[PDB]
Amino acid sequence: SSLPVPYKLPVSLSVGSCVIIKGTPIHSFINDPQLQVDFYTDMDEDSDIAFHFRVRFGNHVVMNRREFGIWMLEETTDYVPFEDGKQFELCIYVHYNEYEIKVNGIRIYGFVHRIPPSFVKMVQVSRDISLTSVCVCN
Amino acid sequence: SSLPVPYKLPVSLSVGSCVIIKGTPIHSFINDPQLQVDFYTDMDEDSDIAFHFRVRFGNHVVMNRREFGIWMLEETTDYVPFEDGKQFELCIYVHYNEYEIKVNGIRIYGFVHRIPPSFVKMVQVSRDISLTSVCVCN
Ligand SMILES: OC[C@H]1O[C@@H](O[C@H]2[C@H](O)[C@@H](O)[C@H](O)O[C@@H]2CO)[C@H](O)[C@@H](O)[C@H]1O
Ligand SMILES: OC[C@H]1O[C@@H](O[C@H]2[C@H](O)[C@@H](O)[C@H](O)O[C@@H]2CO)[C@H](O)[C@@H](O)[C@H]1O
């Protein structure tokens, strides 16, 4: 891996920001690797989470938020167009009302803001992946 | 311009970070547009500056830092391979001992750290340019 995992990046996000994550799962899909991205409101991992994104490769994605320390209503999609064994590109674009999530150029979901994205102070990338790069663009 | 100018981006920099700035001068070179990039230690524009980079297009570049409110010893280079009227790409890569500055893929200078780059909390891009994008990569 080019970066440590878990990778905790301090960030300032605004509408128009794009978080681009490139990496590779460290297990084949029959071994169910996971990839997790958390948009944290502080560096402390017990802080609230504006957007939690957990992929079970070859299976499904779960999304949620954590508010006042409580996990809210979970959202899910079965569209996870990752390829077994290959590097992926995960783009999270901050729109005015939602995070748009793209996997290898394919829009899979729009997760609507329940707190403003400017409250996000740290992005954590975790679980069963090797990381090539993380970019934050405006 | 795609972004406001002056553009003040809150950042966290570490060794291995790369700041990529894409834009276009808003005047032809015979009218001496300038481009300025400041690595500020706070959002306040009177805070100390770890790395100040001021291009006079078609002429020369000045670099400096501001410590305890005082401008230090100015450094300069005449290598400024920007093209009149065209979009440029300005990359500032954070090495362990210096900032490496590349203009349109060409390394022009290495500005050595006098305070650690982790002290940089805001990057300001200013003066006579239109901005296409600013990315911070690790
Ligand atoms: O919702 C994200 C959140 O889910 C937790 O796991 C859920 C699980 O997805 C669900 O199937 C089960 O019924 O309840 C669990 C508790 O909410 C995870 O523990 C948590 O880390 C998040 O991933
Ligand atoms: O060194 C960067 C700093 O320079 C100031 O201008 C200098 C100028 O470059 C020099 O030729 C003259 O002799 O002294 C001036 C004052 O230091 C700028 O005013 C400042 O904004 C920075 O660009």
Residue numbers in the entry:
A (entry chain A), B (entry chain A): 2 to 139
Article excerpt on this structure:
All three other variants (R53HH57R, R53HR55NH57R, and R53HR55NR57RD33G) co-crystallized with lactose, but not Tris, even when the crystallization conditions contained 100 mM Tris. This indicates that these three variants prefer to binding lactose. Without this residue, Gal-13 cannot bind lactose. The present results showed that double mutation of R53 to H and H57 to R was sufficient to recover the ability of Gal-13 to bind lactose. Arg57 in R53HH57R and R53HH57RD33G showed two different conformations. Arg57 in one conformation could indirectly stabilize the pyran ring of galactose through a water molecule (W). In the crystal of wild-type Gal-13, Asp33 from one monomer occupies a large part of the ligand binding site of another. However, in the R53HH57R variant, lactose repealed the side chain of Asp33, making Asp33 adopt an awkward conformation. Variant R53HH57R demonstrated greater bio-activity (MAC: 6.25 µg/ml) than wild-type Gal-13, and all other variants had similar activities (25 or 12.5 µg/ml) as wild-type protein.
